[PDB]
Design a protein around this ligand. Structure first.
Ligand code: HC4
Length: 125
């Protein structure tokens, strides 16, 4: 298992070296979205939390298709604000409840080191 702590200050640098396979080795869920909310990456830990099969969600829009409970000012709103601002680094609790047992989680969104890509890190609370 890759040794990286949720919420680590330089997490974006560390994950820039990881391929989809090493990303599956994290202790928390990790989703990479492009500026429009499309899923580029989605690790195994996230699949365990959301129950969705990784390879099947990639390419799908996170706010419209996959996680509609996140289509709100509290989640999607902070994301859209961050993309347009070109900066994003926020953490908060949220409850995941679309087609799944209501699950409380800690979310951490942060701009990737890459160009137009952003990270959503998820862990159980
Ligand atoms: C609200 O809907 C939050 C998260 C979420 C994640 C994965 C899937 O499939 C649905 C919903």
């Amino acid at each position: 298992m890759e040794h990286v702590a949720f919420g680590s200050e330089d997490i974006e640098n560390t994950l820039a070296k990881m391929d989809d396979g090493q990303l599956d080795g994290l202790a928390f869920g990790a989703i990479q979205l492009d500026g429009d909310g499309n899923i580029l990456q989605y690790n195994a830990a996230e699949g365990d939390i959301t129950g969705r099969d990784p390879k099947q969600v990639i390419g799908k829009n996170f706010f419209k298709d996959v996680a509609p409970c996140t289509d709100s000012p509290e989640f999607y709103g902070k994301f859209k604000e961050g993309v347009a601002s070109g900066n994003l680094n926020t953490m908060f609790e949220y409850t995941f409840d679309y087609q799944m047992t209501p699950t409380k989680v800690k979310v951490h969104m942060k701009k990737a080191l890459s160009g137009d890509s952003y990270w959503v890190f998820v862990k159980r609370v």
